[PDB]
Structure 1
């Protein structure tokens, strides 16, 4: 039994392993999520592969229940075990209280796990941050984020990953009410977002939506070029 304290206090009141783990988040690939009034949509950027092999295994967007989708950033290995324990927990809610899980409840589970996981012995903290999107029962779409310290935190839209503060500046500099008027207009907002942060708007995008009553749906790379094409068309006539 490797009984040793790891997370100790700094002489000025800081947790060095925590704030290094947030840097390991800060070098991860950029993922952006927004919410619509009727259809939520999110997508990771920087697929960054050799573009000559497989890819379904690198999909950084998973579901937890029918109504709960989830993406993340940071290092890949620590994420999926949190995904597994979250799936066991959200199944165990249904083994208990009969309704599906609320996104606020499952995010309190994740952040509550992560905090005591920093409080424990002999453990480096997790080096991931996640965006958790769910349209709950009675159709109130919302989302949250997860700090590596474990502070669940609601948003109307957010963006984490390498080069995310400028993307957040674009989102506050661009988010209106009528931006969430049409669903494809919201997708045009997200593709407008990633595009001006992920530079070359090729096949690096990986978007996935939910119409608040369905499962998740990932568009094939045809509406990527279609929506990017009409985006460059609208910017082309705008210029």
Structure 2
């Protein structure tokens, strides 16, 4: 087996591999999500299509289980391993507890994996950051962001990838209790945040809204454009 020291301490206490892992996800796609009232809205940005690509395989937004659905940004490869692992653990809690997972219990496991690979020998740290949305047994919306350092935090709204700080500035200003009440305004808030970074116009994004009754269904591009003419 390969046993070597990859992530080691430096002067001031910085970790190079942990800091360099963030540089990968900051250069990826921009993923934005908002925690609403009865609905959670999440969407990602697509680089390019040019009619030659299958829109199914380029999807960043995935589904860990019925209640919890996770999307990622940045390097796509590493996310494939986590999603394959997490979906196994979505059944593990349903196995023992006989209840679906919460947004925290699926995040702790994903946070625990990133911790182990920022420390243990021979394994490089994940260069990915994910935004996990889901509802509890009571339908309370929850959003827990995962970090490549292995920690996690909660957010009403936040962005990852390119322009994550610029979009966060737009989210703090326009977030109101009236936006989370109206399903439209909740969806419109996410679209306006995604259109700020995109200067090319059109629809470069794949928008998916996950409700309670009839959970999540990915919105068709015509349904996405339906809300573009209203905000234009």
**For the superposition of Structure 1 and Structure 2, which TM-score range results when normalised by the shorter chain?**
over 0.9
Q: Deviations over 1:191-233 (max 9, x none)?
A: 11101112233120110011123331111111222211111xx
Instruction: Please give the alpha-carbon distance, in whole angstroms, between the structure 1 residues aligned to 2:93 and 2:181.
Output: 34
TM-score normalised by the chain length of structure 2: 0.96
Aligned-partner SS, 2:129: strand
Q: Deviations over 1:165-208 (max 9, x none)?
A: 11110000111111122101111111111011122331201100
- Superposition CA RMSD, Å: 1.3
Instruction: Please give the alpha-carbon distance, in whole angstroms, between the structure 2 residues aligned to 1:49 and 1:176.
Output: 34
In structure 1, what is the equivalent of residue 212 of structure 2? 212
Structure 1 segments unaligned to the other structure (5+ residues): 232-238
Structure 2 segments unaligned to the other structure (5+ residues): none
Instruction: Please give the alpha-carbon distance, in whole angstroms, between the structure 1 residues aligned to 2:171 and 2:48.
Output: 23
Instruction: Please give the alpha-carbon distance, in whole angstroms, between the structure 2 residues aligned to 1:201 and 1:104.
Output: 36
Shift of 1:117: 1.8
Instruction: Please give the alpha-carbon distance, in whole angstroms, between the structure 1 residues aligned to 2:46 and 2:58.
Output: 12
Number of positions where the alignment pairs a residue of Structure 1 with one of Structure 2: 232
Q: Deviations over 1:79-115 (max 9, x none)?
A: 0110010011111111111100111011001101110
CA contact (8 A) 1:24 1:74 kept: yes
CA contact (8 A) 2:17 2:118 kept: no
Shift of 1:47: 4.2
Aligned-partner SS, 2:118: helix
TM-score normalised by the chain length of structure 1: 0.94
In structure 1, what is the equivalent of residue 129 of structure 2? 129
Matching of residues 217-228 of structure 1 within 5 Å: 217-228=217-228
Instruction: Please give the alpha-carbon distance, in whole angstroms, between the structure 1 residues aligned to 2:100 and 2:180.
Output: 26
CA contact (8 A) 1:208 1:218 kept: yes
Instruction: Please give the alpha-carbon distance, in whole angstroms, between the structure 1 residues aligned to 2:181 and 2:111.
Output: 32
Shift of 1:12: 1.9
CA contact (8 A) 1:143 1:154 kept: yes
Shift of 1:46: 3.0
Q: Is 2:197 aligned against 1:162?
A: no
Shift of 1:116: 1.4
Aligned-partner SS, 1:58: coil
Q: Deviations over 1:32-60 (max 9, x none)?
A: 00011001111002342223331111100
Shift of 1:62: 0.7
Instruction: Please give the alpha-carbon distance, in whole angstroms, between the structure 1 residues aligned to 2:26 and 2:47.
Output: 17
Instruction: Please give the alpha-carbon distance, in whole angstroms, between the structure 2 residues aligned to 1:140 and 1:42.
Output: 16
CA contact (8 A) 1:46 1:198 kept: no
